[PDB]
Amino acid sequence: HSMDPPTFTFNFNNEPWVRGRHETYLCYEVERMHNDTWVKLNQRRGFLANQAPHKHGFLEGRHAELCFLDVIPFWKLDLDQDYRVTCFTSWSPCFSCAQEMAKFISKNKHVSLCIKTARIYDDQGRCQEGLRTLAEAGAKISIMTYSEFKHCWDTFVDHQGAPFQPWDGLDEHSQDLSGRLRAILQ
Template identity: 45%
Template sequence: MWVARGGEGGDPQGGPMTWVPPACAHRRLMDINTFEENFRDKKRKTYLCYKVEVREGDPWTPVLEHWDYLRNQGADTPWLPRHHAELCFLDLFPSWPLDQEKQYRLTWYISWSPCPDCVPELVEFLKKNSHVSLRIFAAHVYTYIHGLRDLRDAGAQLAIMTRNEHQHCWDTFVDSQGQPFGPWPNMEEHIADQCDELENILWNREN
């Protein structure tokens, strides 16, 4: 589908014609370079793609108006206060008119796993919102121990992004211009290394 889109923060009425997946035409998309630099390479920025689903009977139903992405504030946006992407999400969440009588599943695809400063806030968020579950798929994992265990113990599901999750982000959150997703060299080795790292953090009781 080809639609008129502005750039990030631009005027959607005056933007060039770009290819947008039909399910995503109502919202902004991340450019290819940003996705590759942060989800493939180890840039020290955090980008967080999120989606919300609600349980309607057995299946989870997408709440498409709450699918988007966030990034850290402050490092190269000096007009904004410094704020990690995870905390930007927590600031945004209360503005959504979600029905507390229903169950919601939040899924994050994040370039780096949550840092020690963000984990306590996420743990508190999960304690206060029993109608919400959280799944986190990280492209890279910070090598610290107890914070991620605390997050797991609070009910969050933690995993490393596999090729399937990268593909899903490409199809859903990236302005791919119709280009197919292609794995990068040593992608599977990186995924295996990060999976081992996360497994060691979460389950190695000697640490």
């Protein structure tokens, strides 16, 4: 349903000099194109996170991005309509998730994917390749700014009427990250 406020603050914080944000949270919403305008679909919104590994071991816990792809077919989107699916993510995807997402959007031309991320995850391995591959397949990847954090608080958090409280350095971090993303995607 709605995210717990402390969970939001801990996970969407874009501060560079802290650690421990090991989870990925993903909030999604959907619009449909009508008369050159994106119209929000009321019911098609939610959030999810990565899953814990199963007790049997061997396999990693299912990543948030794969869960996201799992749910989309259940929305019964009309293949003749055009949709914009926006994901607000606390981290950008790992390589294998990026590859899967790229495959999905290549096969589902009715979906325009936008990924707005709090933080870039760059393992200095294949993460950059993944992001480039995902953008090549048509995804629009960007860094969350104040307005997107506030939107996510208002739309996905169990705020009980309380307003979004920005943290110190929010815009400076977003700007640094936007520059880093430009360098990855160039």
